[PDB]
Amino acid sequence: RMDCPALPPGWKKEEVIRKSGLSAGKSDVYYFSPSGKKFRSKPQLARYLGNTVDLSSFDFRTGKMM
Amino acid sequence: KRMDCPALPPGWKKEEVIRKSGLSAGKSDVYYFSPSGKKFRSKPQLARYLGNTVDLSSFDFRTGKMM
DNA sequence: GCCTACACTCCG
DNA sequence: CGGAGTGTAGGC
């Protein structure tokens, strides 16, 4: 859970390696709000942040604007 | 629908799926299934699997017909 | 400009 | 972690 400096304050990001199976070696990226709720996708996070914030160019995987 | 593909060996089936949203909403993707149910998504993948048991040179992946 | 082919997301 | 469903680079 590394702080995510691109987002508003309190946010963290984590990456977790897949350990077996066909996709072994790939990873999943998670975000955690201030509240601490977990986010697993761009649409999910963009819904939660709402018309509050525009993440069109937000790269979910890297946590940077692209 | 999984349709028999008569030009492939017995039991092989083809299914066409319409994309429901995004950049290519309305376009389709074509998939093949082996007799056991293994899914294939391209001509070179299907040709690699079958090897010399079929000649796919003239096989139109999209329509499932020899030309 | 359109298509194949395959990588990747997203959510179960 | 799987895999249907979509993104898209590169060939043509």
Q: In terms of residue numbers, what domain contains A31?
A: 1-66
| Residue B37 exposure: Cα atoms within 13 Å on the Cβ side | 0
CA of A52 vs C1' of D8, distance in Å?
A: 30
Closest-CA residue to B3 (of B22, B17, B23): B17
Domains: count for chain A = 1
Phi-psi sector, B52: left (phi>0), alpha (psi -120 to 50), beta:
alpha
Say how far B32 CA is from C12 C1', in Å.
Answer: 24
DSSP designation for A21: S
User: What span, in angstroms and rounded, lies between the C-alpha atoms of B46 and B39?
Assistant: 9
From CA B50, how far away is CA B10, in angstroms rounded?
13
- What is the phi/psi pair of residue B26, to 5°? 95, -25
B60 near B30, Cβ under 8 Å?
no
Give the method of determination: X-ray
At B61, which CATH number? 3.30.890.10
* Nearest residue (CA) to C1' of D5: B19
State the resolution, in angstroms: 1.8
HSE-up (13 A, CA, CB side) for residue A29: 13
